[PDB]
Design a binder for this molecule. Structure first.
Ligand SMILES: Nc1ncnc2c1ncn2[C@@H]1O[C@H](COP(=O)(O)O)[C@@H](O)[C@H]1O
Ligand SMILES: Nc1ncnc2c1ncn2[C@@H]1O[C@H](COP(=O)(O)O)[C@@H](O)[C@H]1O
Ligand SMILES: Nc1ncnc2c1ncn2[C@@H]1O[C@H](COP(=O)(O)O)[C@@H](O)[C@H]1O
Ligand SMILES: Nc1ncnc2c1ncn2[C@@H]1O[C@H](COP(=O)(O)O)[C@@H](O)[C@H]1O
Lengths: 149, 149, 149
């Protein structure tokens, strides 16, 4: 039983030129790239991405920081929603565990490199927001017998 | 002072072609390769290796997954039995700590890349099962003065 | 918002030829190299470095192990004193978390690769002991807008 999560490299990941290193961390566990697209995020889409925070005082500055190039991604694997969050580490890099993306690359929450869905419901919503169904690619990894039980 | 542990790269580690990366993680700590042999594990030797699980429902499928090429290894170092277990991480990759082999490479317990002895008693038994005493090589690391206090 | 910490690669780090790997771990978080100097540590400077331990029975052996080439470093970043300690890991490599320098490279406390300041007061004192003010370089990282919130 696999699932799919939405992972997005934020503008700091693009500008620091660590896109490949980020992708390699997820590929290393045998997670499958199901979708990938470079875009420039707009306020219109970011308002919906961050809909839970409508009306909050930090939302304008958060949208501003995110208005830039991003890499939209979908990865598939067992428990991948929760596992991707564990791999990213805590929101605040200073609190994240060594070995996580945020602890290894970052200093502050406002520049923490990557977003990932926080739940099954959020993953479905975010994938549908950033990708049309025709952009989601279904194929089987050739090493499946050595990745899955 | 130093101990020796039995570590075995499972068929998934061979087939995913991460043998060198695994070895490098142990070399990086100054652990000494005391023995190393590629073989193909067979049901008869695997039944001995997993003797504690004789008759349990999972054992046939476990033996099937393990019937394939494996890299038998003995590493030497301070506290290396417990330390190698810590470096492998939890049996279930989803529970293993960031930075461990199983967290960094794997998804499920049935394909968790590597075996390591769980105790001094098990290390003695496993080394005797998979190696002849004379495949264990005695030599000293030239960097010993900078590895050991 | 940023502070500076004193980090010193010990003779084992020099002799095992992992200096670049150590530096890369700190650069990876966008920490700025403010000072760097190769020297050979001598007993008289080490007595001042370890002044808090005057009279303790372990001090002579400690000074002996530390007599050798060292790389003196100052890194700057948000919370970098505490964060560098977290990245080094526990004094004893066998207790340190996977993903930390000491867990990834070392076996014993007496050969644990690196020193880092333990507090704001120790950072100020150690920086002044090992570096003259003219050796501390002030410049801005070009990627600052993507490192700092
Ligand atoms: N500037 C901020 N202030 C408060 N909370 C934030 C801020 N930025 C991000 N968050 C929280 O962290 C979560 C993940 O944000 P993101 O990684 O940008 O998707 C959001 O859903 C917020 O709950
Ligand atoms: N399929 C399984 N079912 C139950 N326990 C298992 C299974 N695979 C591994 N284990 C446990 O994990 C330990 C180490 O297994 P291995 O790494 O395959 O030698 C065994 O000694 C078992 O206790
Ligand atoms: N170079 C060393 N050799 C042996 N033991 C040490 C050394 N440095 C620190 N320790 C001890 O290791 C233990 C753990 O250190 P810490 O985690 O820093 O409290 C303490 O009890 C220290 O006294
Ligand atoms: N041989 C030792 N015995 C006990 N404690 C030690 C020893 N070496 C270092 N320590 C402790 O660990 C701290 C960090 O040591 P260092 O990394 O050498 O600066 C020292 O300030 C001591 O508190």
């Amino acid at each position: 039983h696999v699932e799919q999560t939405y992972l997005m490299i934020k503008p700091d990941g693009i500008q620091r030129q660590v896109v490949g290193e980020i992708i390699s961390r997820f590929e290393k566990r045998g997670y499958r790239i199901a979708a990938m697209k470079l875009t420039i995020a707009t306020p219109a889409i970011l308002e919906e991405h961050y809909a839970e925070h409508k009306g909050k005082p930090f939302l304008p500055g958060l949208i501003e920081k995110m208005t830039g190039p991003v890499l939209c991604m979908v990865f598939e694997g067992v428990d991948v929603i929760a596992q991707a969050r564990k791999m990213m580490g805590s929101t605040r890099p200073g609190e994240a565990a060594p070995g996580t993306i945020r602890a290894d690359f970052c200093q502050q929450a406002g520049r923490n490199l990557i977003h990932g869905s926080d739940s099954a419901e959020s993953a479905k919503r975010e994938i549908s927001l950033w990708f049309k169904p025709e952009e989601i690619q279904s194929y089987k990894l050739a090493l499946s017998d050595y990745i899955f039980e």
